[PDB]
Amino acid sequence: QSVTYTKLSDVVDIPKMTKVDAESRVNKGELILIKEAGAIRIARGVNSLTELTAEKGEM
Amino acid sequence: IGLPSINISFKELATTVKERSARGIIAMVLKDAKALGLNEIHEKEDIPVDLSAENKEYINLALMGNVNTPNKLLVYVIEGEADIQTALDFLETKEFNYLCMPKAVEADKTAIKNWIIKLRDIDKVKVKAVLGKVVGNHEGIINFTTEDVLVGEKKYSVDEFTSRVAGLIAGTPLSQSVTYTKLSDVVDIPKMTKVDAESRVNKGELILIKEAGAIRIARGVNSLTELTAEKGEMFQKIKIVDTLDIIHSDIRKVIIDDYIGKVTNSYDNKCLLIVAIKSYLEELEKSALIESDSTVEIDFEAQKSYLKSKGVDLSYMTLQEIKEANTGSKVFLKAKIKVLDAMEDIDLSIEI
Amino acid sequence: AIGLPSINISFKELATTVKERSARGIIAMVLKDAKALGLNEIHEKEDIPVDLSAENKE
Amino acid sequence: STVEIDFEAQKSYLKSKGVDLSYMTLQEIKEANTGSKVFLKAKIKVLDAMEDIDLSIEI
Amino acid sequence: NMEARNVMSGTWGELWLDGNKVAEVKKFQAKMEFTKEDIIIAGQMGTDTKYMGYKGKGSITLYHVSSRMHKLIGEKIKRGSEPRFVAISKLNDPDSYGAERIAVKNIAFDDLTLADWEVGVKGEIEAPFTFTEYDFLDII
Amino acid sequence: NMEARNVMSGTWGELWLDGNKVAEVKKFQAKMEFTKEDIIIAGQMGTDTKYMGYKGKGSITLYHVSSRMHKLIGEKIKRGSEPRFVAISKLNDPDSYGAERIAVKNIAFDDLTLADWEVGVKGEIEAPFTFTEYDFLDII
Amino acid sequence: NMEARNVMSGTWGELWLDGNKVAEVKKFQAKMEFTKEDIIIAGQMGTDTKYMGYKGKGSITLYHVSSRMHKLIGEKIKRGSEPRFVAISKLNDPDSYGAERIAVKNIAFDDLTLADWEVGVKGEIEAPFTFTEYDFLDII
Amino acid sequence: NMEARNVMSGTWGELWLDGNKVAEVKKFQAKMEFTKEDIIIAGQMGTDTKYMGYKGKGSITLYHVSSRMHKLIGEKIKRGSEPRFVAISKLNDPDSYGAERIAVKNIAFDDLTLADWEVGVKGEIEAPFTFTEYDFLDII
Amino acid sequence: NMEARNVMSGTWGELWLDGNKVAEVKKFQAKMEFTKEDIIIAGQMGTDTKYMGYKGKGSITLYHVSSRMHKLIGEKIKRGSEPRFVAISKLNDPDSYGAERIAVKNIAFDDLTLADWEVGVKGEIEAPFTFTEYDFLDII
């Protein structure tokens, strides 16, 4: 499995935070919590790597 | 545990309440200085006493249903002197079908219109609102323009009758439509001509009309007025948009619950997902919501375009190789359905 | 450019069919125009040089 | 998946030790003595999970 | 165009039952039997037939490695509630033209085997069934 | 995960009858047959079925070493009183995942063999039966 | 406790018919078939059975050396008077635990063979019968 | 021009009772029986007839899935009020020339089945009736 | 929405007679037969009918396991006193939409079977009756 869209039941509230900002942050490479239908869940399962080279690609 | 109790009591007859409906969830925003928060109102009897009598009458108007009472009422209370966006933020978390707010101003209506348009287009969530005087071109916005509705020797403005309209719409079952639906409680409507009614219904307003007998709704159109090749005349009808939204919500719930992150992206799992979606469509066909002979399939052109975008050489590639290729984390699918409309116009020629 | 998960379900109508494009034949062809000289290799109706006139387009 | 002797690292180590790699067969380089060092290379493939789904419906 | 290599071998078959892959599968079968009625037409020596409907019948044979069918149907059958399943079969021979993948729906099994063993004999299970619907995915 | 060694061999089977271990079992069998009724639904080409009940049927084959069945049923059958028994079968192959143990209840036998022998042939006994109930112990 | 030597060999069988020893027996058989009736009980998926009675059936096969059956039944059958006989079978293998001796009573034969021969084939006779009663002597 | 495919199959029938479609319909029929009087004319050997009227009769059979007829007529029949109904029958075979649709009016049922069930058998209900009028829609 | 699983199976029936459950019930049925009078109206070709009343009829069959009906009615019938009973029938199939329960009141039996037995056949008893009233509980 993966950690994308994994719901955190314990967490209750996050500061107000916009969708386009989340897109930009995950584009830079960040793990953030997002508000979505139902409980609070993980936006994406990326790590901190952001440099793209012939040796190490998107995967 | 006490002694055995055998009590036989005598009482008079009591009135019968209208049957509850499984479908239809409506959220309303009220402004009161006391008892802020979210309240779930299931029955007309259970209303918090902190609210004013005027808010109670708005709730009561929302409670009545066309054929059945709406399933659940979500009320959010804000004291006032506050931005509407803070209530919209809380409402984004919950699940609802219609949004109405009797105490409205022009800026508040603009905010709600923008918020719902943004949700429907970007957030991929299908929600609707009933607004007093809004010229929004979207299907998610319902424009109801009738002035000075008088019920039981009272005066209701156009903006504060939207709760009743939303309750009426939520009470209607899927098989039927709100066209020519009559309101017994309503007594009098200001005088108005038929040509004006034709012009307004062509413009895209949901208005009240006075016919033989009680008052009734003229037509069940949306606020959509501009048509394209992709969006035809079908999307202007409330019933069709409602069933499409139901299909969207069901499929999204299934996909989110069972497939996102859980399973690996391989062609066999795509076939399993296709079979599941086909089974859901068959279930819909059995209930007669949609016509028979619906299909689900892999969208070949989108997959090939995606492969071209990533620089994959399609030369010397079999159609099976292209169809079964690895697409990273993306799944491309397409489907086809058909929906009918209700009976509204009749021509009968009699020869004597 | 990775982003947030996207689950979109779109409603539409009235698609249309097209003509199949084949890999069968090759044709040698001669044109005269005062610009965009040299050979020109064309596979589809959209990658035509705008330099050629409409009469040459015909 | 494949497992084999890492040729490039072995050749680099042979250069670092002063050995001459010219007029040497591939097989000769493969089974050359490398002291206490073993260089191996393996190649495997992994697949991602479903994250984004596109559904087009025509009425 | 035909070469003897183009015949599909049954070793390249795969089966999914109720969404779960089964690896110890020996054979799979599915077939539709038509119901026909004889109709004698006046003035014609050759009698004709009228098509009325069909029967779907199949069977699955698998090596005895786990209690798959017990867990699937045993407890529900006793209580009086009958379950229905979906199966997907794929035949993909590398030397053939392409793959063949069919989904068989509304499957109801005919029996349940609790124990069948013999000294000096390896275990096997045969499970007949009936069905009503099907779909085509990737036909040749 | 699937290997040829994981298939259960029938040599590793064990049987208890009426609480007594029988060392001399050749094969054991138990199976439930469902009763189904055809139902034609208007507007549908594929006919469906309705589940109505089941039959349990089995058999035991054993080498002829003692008079087990005679002592079990012979005298009671003549008097008009029919006995009922319980059997437990266990299949435990060391190379498989685990054991399979099932209890078969309310067993009534179909016949009784008094003598069956031939010159130059070793003796064997076959005893079919029916049953109604069962339980699961240690399924895989 | 079991050794492969404990299985009874059929070469060690003996038969007495009407009090006379027959040295020429090839096989002997006797078996009781129960009569059962299906009974469906409300609220129960597994159908049960009721025991009603039994049928005894058997057969004797012997090498053709004398006219035993002719002398036994031929003249009486024509006159309309049917005879009844008693048979005793004994199975005594030295390597087994013990002997098994059963008396089969009220035997009525099914047919009579007058002649059955073929060139290059040795003679044999098969005689089916029915019976009603039995007794146990020296069971294991 | 007669073909075997043109014969109408009854699996393509459909029924509407009191404005509501009945999915579980099994059989439908309706018939008008003419009343005739024999007349003998002087000088004429063959007897002739006179037509005086007709009486309509029909029947419906459905699979037992709900208490439809109870809700239709049960309470009303006790109080002494008799309801009349309208039924529409449609037969549309894809291989036939066209569809056939008839409305049967002024229907009065003959009885009401409160309960008829049998262990081991599926439920069915048969309901005869009488009618007076009819109308033609989409005649062939 | 018609499915084959929704058809009610009669093995799930239950009966209460005079307040006591009867486990050995085999069959139950109850029916109301309407009385109709033909009426011919001048100027109308089709004959019409008038509803005048109804008569209730039913039957019960049980497996012969006890002398229930004897104790119920035998002594009373001789003296000239006729008892009336109440019966409750329940049909609750797990695969159906819901349960159906009907109470049949003012039951008068038609006869009393003192003895009916047959060698080789199991015992059964059939008891017809007539009734007047009914009530609906848990209608579908």
Residue numbers in the entry:
A (entry chain C): 178 to 236
B (entry chain D): 3 to 354
C (entry chain f): 2 to 59
D (entry chain C): 296 to 354
E (entry chain a), F (entry chain k), G (entry chain l), H (entry chain B), I (entry chain P): 3 to 142
Paper text:
Here, we report the atomic structures of an engineered diffocin, a contractile syringe-like molecular machine that kills the Gram-positive bacterium Clostridioides difficile. Since the sheath and the tube are anchored together at the opposite end by the collar, collapsing the sheath pushes the tube through the baseplate, driving it to puncture the cell wall and underlying cytoplasmic membrane.
There is a symmetry mismatch among the three major parts of the diffocin: the collar (C6 symmetry), the trunk (C6+helical symmetry), and the baseplate (C6 + C3 symmetry). By applying the corresponding symmetry during single-particle reconstructions, we determined cryoEM structures of the collar, trunk, and baseplate regions of pre-contraction diffocin separately at resolutions of 2.7 Å, 2.2 Å, and 2.6 Å, respectively. The N-terminal domain of the collar subunit binds to the tube, while its C-terminal β-strand extends towards the C-terminal β-hairpin of last sheath, forming a three-β-strand handshake interaction. These interfaces are maintained during contraction, enabling the collar to function as a force transducer between sheath contraction and tube ejection. We define these conformations as conformers A, B, C, and D. As the trunk assembles from the baseplate to the collar, conformer A forms the first layer, followed by alternating contributions from conformers B and C, and finally, conformer D terminates the sheath by interacting with the collar.
